[model samples]
Target chain A: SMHHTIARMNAFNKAFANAKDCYKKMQAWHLLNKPKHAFFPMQNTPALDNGLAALYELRGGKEDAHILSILSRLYLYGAWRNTLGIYQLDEEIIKDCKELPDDTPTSIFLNLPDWCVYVDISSAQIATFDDGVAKHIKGFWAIYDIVEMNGINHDVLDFVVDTDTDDNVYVPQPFILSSGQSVAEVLDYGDTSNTLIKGLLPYLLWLCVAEPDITYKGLPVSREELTRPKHINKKTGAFVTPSEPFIYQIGERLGSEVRRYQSIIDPHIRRGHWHGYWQGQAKEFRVRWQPAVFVN
Target chain B: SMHHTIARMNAFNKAFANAKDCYKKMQAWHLLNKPKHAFFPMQNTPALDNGLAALYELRGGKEDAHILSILSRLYLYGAWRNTLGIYQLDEEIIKDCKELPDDTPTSIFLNLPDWCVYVDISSAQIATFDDGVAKHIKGFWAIYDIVEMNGINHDVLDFVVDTDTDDNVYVPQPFILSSGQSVAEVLDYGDTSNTLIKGLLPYLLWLCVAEPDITYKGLPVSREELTRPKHINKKTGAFVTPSEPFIYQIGERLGSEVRRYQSIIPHIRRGHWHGYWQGQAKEFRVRWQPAVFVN
Candidate 1:
């Protein structure tokens, strides 16, 4: 069984590496002006694509490697979810997958071309997973990944439902984006019942892959194992248990680390404060600073 | 003798009051658009009147009471000097008055309608005083006044000749103005020997009256007394002793005080430095300041 798991892990890693290569190729194509035409015309595109394009231009066309890595991992996560046949929905997981109400503004990602893809997989994965609630937790983690990619930093959204344990599960708390809008408002995916799967789940697939050591059911799971379902008990019609999703173990840590990077990349997102200096003869004069005001 | 001195003092005070009144009238007249005509156009006129008028306008038609009072006292000093016949040329004073070579630019006062009057009086006074060196002393003082008036705050032009005790005198040191020009360069009153009496002395006579407590040879001489020569010791069959001039006692005090005002009125006249403040977030951001460059 361990050998089988190791083989699965190697396969996932190989897939992740290929996805990463694809992303790099995409960036290099854009930089080199390949195909002699704009492969992606920005006009009349989805709001998400337009916004991402604008952000790309703002950074002078530089690729954010972190966001790219997360995206590559997320692509593999979607592939693995389908390949592993964990699509059979579990009753308890479905119950836990109930959507939480969100009032935050829609995140910029919702307008991108990939946003629909994210939603499709998120909802489909929920229906696919044995424990839909675990899928819901993964969805929220995905939302965090997307949020962070778009330059918003938030506390981790670690919510996992352990099939072998009691039903109590962690839920993601709503947070504000750098744009001063609420995260819930930005990620509003409409279908409240499948909100976790349709709205947040697509974002977290990358995190599980990126942070494989994350624990579930008190046991550390490898990236490949996290992508599959598990059987918990032995003979005599022993109860079947699902693999604990890693989102719960690593959500907060991921969120915090991303937030730190977010602050460095865009300082204005952080809270404001004061400083002082000398002015006149012998540097003896002191001047008090007036508070900074954001005009817009 | 006491009563006679009192009468003289009272008369001198009365003259001083009138002179002060004349100055105020002059300022008011200028402020009110005057006699519907320029009574003293910058044409051919007495150097004293023209120079005073120019100074008035330089202050943007605003009156500097201190300079006004000093000018008024100077007018009185001139009158008393002539009246008391301290006019007898003192060889030491004339020799001391020999113009010291100055390479600094000529002061704005020298370009006035009364530039010649300033030159004349500056030269003549030194001829009249006991030691021409006092003239050199006054030349420096004049430089201080011009510098301060022009809003130059310098730390070096702080010397004053004190004549209250023995012959220890306050000599003016050279210094640069905010204009990057030396005070000496600015006050090059032409004649090397008699520069002060002609250039700056006529400016300080009123200071004698305004500050009678200013002493010369340990005697608190009145403005009128300052104008005249006197004998300090009589029993030694002393031929005569001239009263130490009041200019020496007051020059430093005057220059320093005016400099203090200069600093207050136009602080930018001094060198510049840096100051800072907090920008965004906790205090992680730092802004580098541009170095101050004087144009």
Candidate 2:
């Protein structure tokens, strides 16, 4: 759930960049700083999601576009699924997550300190709509398509995708290789002093809780041009320009035996995992992510 | 995610079972009849969740008891996580799910028609708090605990758990076998003329959209016993009774290759999946479920 913040930073950036005044930028900046307040009248819908994603596409933010696209999928799926439990978000139980109260479910914290896993986990099997009520497990193989032209090269930045020999698609997962990286670096929240990552942490915690249908008013690109038939074309979610070659784990190649398993009709990569760990400390905290991919 | 529906059935049964009268039972029956309307002023909260779960405990609903407990966790986790997307649920886009719209992502529907997978996927690795923000993935092995005395034996009902040699815990994953079973049989909604399975299909689509904080006014159990130290004790969700000894694929023993994976100091059962499929046609549409377990 902490990984959900990656989308928030991207979403806020769209707002920050297009804010009418510097004051609005500061206001939008604080919203990220205090995520709980952001949920009251939440604004994370497909219209807004695709809008921001379109903006990212226009700005050459392939990773941001793809990640936001998937987060949009998660919000759509999780919101519907969670309606089985509660109607709306609770100010009370959500707060209980921070405190390990006997009355509520136990909450634990384990932030990683050393090197981290890849970042694509937020997209793959975990949040995929194929995992939702519709097609589900059996549809795993058939649905997920290959990527399109933007196979956005590694030279772009922190995240990127690499197609195999057969043009089979695989994306590079993000890793925090340099300890000097900024935690909330993606969003251009004008007033640099604020926008603390810790404050925004809890906001992403209960996404399906309150799914507001508001739109990002000033999107830079046209919707039709921005999001092009997400799954219909050879383009499923996942694109980037980040580095450490974006550490996908690609199920990290082992010795001969793993190669033997690879020989079998396998697009699977021994199941790379979805992970969440931070850099050294709170001040030095950066979300280093990793996700599994179907390697050819 | 048919397994997600197990929570819905349990949730609706409470509303059906605890209705004020036959008239209220009919209204509540229709409520489950269309889950989307249930989301209008969505009434699922800790107070409501705990209230109904407590009612289940009082009714000796051990399995219903545990499943609802965890569904509460998923609702809490997914809700907060989703606010990052949009503020409210969309009537238009959600409707877009049925048609494979090019503007929207591809929406495929593949439901199994024969004996299906198990049912616990809705609760395990898929929805645990460890998967959420508090601790995320690294805290996986540490947090999930062993079960309570309410291990809710197979004799009790459909969903049951089997402890390992070291008292390590596991719950039964449900598989649909009997072809004659009714799809939406859990709830006792009165005047059952219109509670078709297909009608309730799109209702549970987007949960975090509108989470109204209303209470289940007439609960049968007390909050205290309904939801105990959910994570504190040997109790951490999943309890029930009803079934063909509840089919827990238990990583269906393969040959030596899997056995070797098992021998290497592992509690992992390879990986069972969270699944969704129907028993047959719309007339026989029972949501057969299956989920992964740590062997």
Candidate 3:
């Protein structure tokens, strides 16, 4: 049976050859010539930024057809990285796209592009610099906690989460807004909701990475500290730092909470709410998402 | 971990090398020129047969010391076959002994030697020739059923179960009379006691074998007929022939019956009842039984 399965894999080499060409075109348009600021916008209205605006301009600002296509292609790259279990793109594709960095971390190119949208959205919602900075820190922790619990490798998790949610979380301006709405409005639109971009997309992306030891908190946090953080003195209101052990306990508690409310959450995600929209029917979204290819 | 386990296996290999030499000497005296009849004795007193007689003579017939040694070595061969997952003996030791058949069916060499003792004992006790013949048939089926149910690779299950009572099913000769008496006394004694060997062994063994189509009595039986035999047909007295379905149902029913009676059977085997002594508590019997090697 193993031999029979291995023989079937021979056909994938040919499929990979064709995929390499399509990936080369995408890398050239998105990763090579695009400004680093466009990738990680610092202004609140990110849709009006140069990188996405250039994409909207190509379609004459008609509808979301072009922008959705760009997002789909970026999702495809994340899916492909997981499917192959190799972070670096194929040499043939990379060679044709752009000059290579001498020693680029694999995470720099992994899920960074798609994760940037969440950073920009969080920046738009928060008010002050301190709150925005704290949101960025919280964003990093959220991605780190989600990915670690879901079993992604720390290196890949940090590479994708750290770069996208770095100091430049807000989208800067100069590019025209195609929808004539604020960047935040465009991001939170019913059809293009932030919950899907900010929640499920990151959730799905984290599932594809490898499992590693949780090393988020400082070393030597006692089990007593984790299990009984505020047990001794409710009056004092003692708390554990948001480290691996603390986050892990939170995750375990959240697992039960989610299970308890799954009946509510499942239907809410299915029927589009103001908070998020159902991207598509199951089959339709699976085809558009392209992540199903790498799921097994 | 792999390297560490391999090193431990190497130590066992050296131990086996010494065992092989010891086994060679036993084979020369026993397996080389032993008559087929000695291997499968027709006499009621099997210890009087040449094969067992040679073993008894070696220890001057004073006790079962030499016989137990012979039984132990035979069991070792069975264990070696199972451990290697192969039927053939080692080429190194085999070269020093008798020539082996090419293309030997693994089962033929697997447990047949030790198993033959039960077949002979069952044969010696059964009344008529036809019943004895059916027992041989039942023996084959019992071995087949036990091996299949236990997932024991037909070879190993037969080697162990056929030689032992298996699951408290039968007892053969020459082991001992467990009622604090010697084995020699029981074989020479009357047939009033140990009627279980003649009666229940055949019945239990027969219950295990495949239930043939009623064609034994009439027409070919259908699979449906075998699977769903009459649940309420007392008037006609119809019954399914003992086949897998029948045997399996019998086994399931017997499981509960055995559990119910285990209190009696457990002590009988442990104390050896009226047939044999407790030897030396738990440890002595374990050492002398020789079946414990394969076990």
Candidate 4:
């Protein structure tokens, strides 16, 4: 409905306004230029969503760790502008991003022949770290091999951004292709296939032979059972509260750690990530995100 | 003139194509988003150019250390969309930015009541640091007080960028406002003083009384004469070639240092910068940029 479109437009305008906040602005700008995670394809195609959808369908169509991480990275690029409006996303939306509705299988999205991938990034309704704040968004993409959906169609995705208010302008509209276009109809192989694809062509061949290299910065918040007090100096131990193998039931919160550059200690960040599980009598998906911290 | 325009366009096209390279791409992307230096203003108006021209004219209109640094920062923001084609700029343009020819007087460009200011960033055909590469551009700007160049006009500045191929796009064109416009006639005070100014409005007031606070990351290169070797031990010293008081004439090059994260030694990078002076019979700006190194 036109109302839906209008609502989406209004929502984006409001989000852009909020990204103007001081701390949010810094975080937004930082993320906007960070080198993107290169796990998926970034081509813009009518077939993109369909391919992604088919892949999701193949995976029994749900949020899994693998798919969710992929989605976040794609949204980070956001079709190369603030199109996904990631600057205003909050912690809740980000958690929601990782929880795709389908409990699915893991298909090698890119190397399995014509298949490739991408995430969504939308948020400033987000985590405040020990040092700064962060934003998030969701991505709806994956290249397809056509078998999963057979003849299923996909709706396209676009963005909304304003690099300069008046001097020079760059804004993305929110309308994609028509209602029910099939994946095969839009997946043009020879010419119309564009820049995102062109960028990925060399990489695609490389990926088929091997997986991409990645360096570890940080990972998901995991709680192992607190079996005993962690010791230092052999059996002569130093038991510290707010240490690892964190106990969800009784560990006290000690706030986040901020970086101190000129200190004798070295510091690196442990960024926020979700910790969730279906628990208790009601069996609902309950969760919490660990705040960003400094490890010195 | 048309030929000039076409050459500019073709040059831009070629540069954009080059930005597709891997290391260059990483370097270009890094620069596009880094926070810019805040020594001057960033408004986009015909008046902006005129005001800037007036300010330069007031200071004898030459590239000096102050004006050159400011120019580099403006070029960094690049109208917020790679409009200056900053991704492909090399080193020589950057060196040229600092040494403004007319170093006659010293006057604060901004907060001198009605007078306010701006820099260019252009380079990547330049330094290859120990860790990564960098880019640069040039800014042509200064605010006016109706004094400098009483009747002279100024030309405008702008950029060029590309976000998505067919999905989405963001680009800036080359032509700024036309030539030979007087300083006072175009310097509008009330309405059209837009975003760059709008963004700076809150800060301008703060800057009037107290200057914008800055923290150091890296700075220009300097060679202190060999007055003494920097001693590591009391009453004793450790001497190493390629060490401090770097001897340009005879010290052999040992290559730039790369970061080793797991090492016990704490390391930080000293990025590349130029060393130059008028000497040895030729009063030229004879110079060499120290390669980026780990300290």
* lDDT tens digits by residue: candidate 1, A52-163: 4465455633455433333333333332332222221122122222222232222322221121111112222221122222222222212222234346433222222211
lDDT of 4 by residue, B44-109 (tens): 211224444465556554544333323332332222212111111122222222211121111212
TM-score, each model? Answer: 0.17, 0.19, 0.16, 0.18
Model 4 TM-score is 0.18
What order do candidates take by TM-score, descending? 2, 4, 1, 3
Name model 1 segments beyond 4 Å from true. Answer: A2-9, A12-97, A104-125, A128-178, A187-296, B1-295
Instruction: Give one digit per residue, the lDDT tens place, for model 1 in B180-274.
Output: 34334443311222222223332332232223223444345555654444431356431221233212232323334435554555222221111
Best by TM-score: 2
Docking class of 1: incorrect
Deviation from native of the Cα of residue B145 in model 4, angstroms: 35
| Every candidate's lDDT | 0.30, 0.24, 0.26, 0.25
Q: Runs in model 3 with CA error above 4 Å?
A: A1-296, B1-19, B22-61, B64-200, B207-295
On residues B1-295, what C-alpha lDDT tens digit does candidate 2 reach at each position?
A: 3332234334544644532222233233334544221111112322334455566556555556455544432332222111111111122222221211112111111121101112222211121111222111110100011122345211101122211111212222222222233233321110111111111222221211122111122222222322233221136422222321222221122222344554564253221112233344532121212112354
Q: Candidate 2 regions off by >4 Å? A: A1-125, A129-169, A172-181, A187-296, B1-17, B20-63, B66-295
Ranking by lDDT: 1, 3, 4, 2
Clashes of each: 53, 70, 21, 59
The residue-by-residue lDDT of candidate 3 on B128-231, one tens digit each, is 11211111212211121111224521212222212211121122222121233332233223221232222223222211123311221223443344434224
Query: For residues A79-180, could you state the per-residue lDDT of candidate 3 as single tens digits?
Result: 222222111111111111111121212232232322222221122121112221322212221121011224531222211222222232221112112232
Error of 4 at B186 (Å): 46
Q: How much DockQ does model 2 earn?
A: 0.02
